[PDB]
């Protein structure tokens with residue numbers, strides 16, 4: 300088979316170990332503070348942790364921006380020079396960011412073949428189809444076949460993004476959408492859909508799993524990526540609760556990056572779900 304590089308953007312919150320394990324690179328989007336300071340959303344443990352403290356203490360909530368066309372071109376040329384034959388890019392929902400269009404535009408100006416997939420998802424749900432793509436490629440599947448299957452998986456809603464936030468004001472401030480209240484959301488057709496408000500994390504956790512249950516019977520086989528915005532204990536509880544009604548053949552936790560955290564706010568907990 301040919302050598303295929305897989306690239307997701309930083310809003311995919313890819314598990315750190317997956318970069319090497321599945322040869323998945325991550326392109327940084329940016330966080331720009333009101334004072335003009337700009338910083339890349341790199342998948343580095345300590346850097347993300349440092350960002351959590353800073354956004355929690357900041358006097359304002361920063362804005363975010365897609366990678367530049369130049370940023371994408373740079374990556375594509377780098378992979379060509381690393382002898383890759385093709386580049387498979389999976390971006391977050393085109394309805395949530397201009398990242399998809401930027402990746403597509405850049406793909407037109409470079410020599411190496413670049414296929415861009417609008418996942419219509421965000422955060423931890425994105426690395427799921429990315430890994431499925433690598434597994435299929437490794438077994439000799441062609442790009443055309445991979446794109447075909449992913450399209451089917453999407454049609455059957457096999458990849459889900461369900462989560463809840465602690466302070467809804469972050470999402471409102473971001474533009475994409477009381478005491479102890481928790482707002483539960485899920486991504487549908489690439490858009491953020493608030494579907495419930497509850498009190499406390501236990502109920503929020505239960506509501507996330509209830510939402511999953513609407514089309515995925517308990518006992519179903521899954522692969523999961525639990526995500527959190529500086530609330531590891533919170534997502535651990537979520538996955539522990541999930542294991543009691545489903546057959547989780549694989550799970551891993553990944554911290555939400557600077558860009559996702561800027562929009563959802565600290566305290567957020569949720570999971571990317573792949574229905575096997």
Ligand SMILES: CCCCCCCCCCCCCCCC(=O)O
Nearest residue numbers: 363364365396422423424562570571
């Ligand atoms: C896996 C479950 C968690 C899902 C979390 C979804 C969070 C969505 C928040 C909106 C992010 C918008 C990013 C805009 C980036 C840009 O500036 O172009």
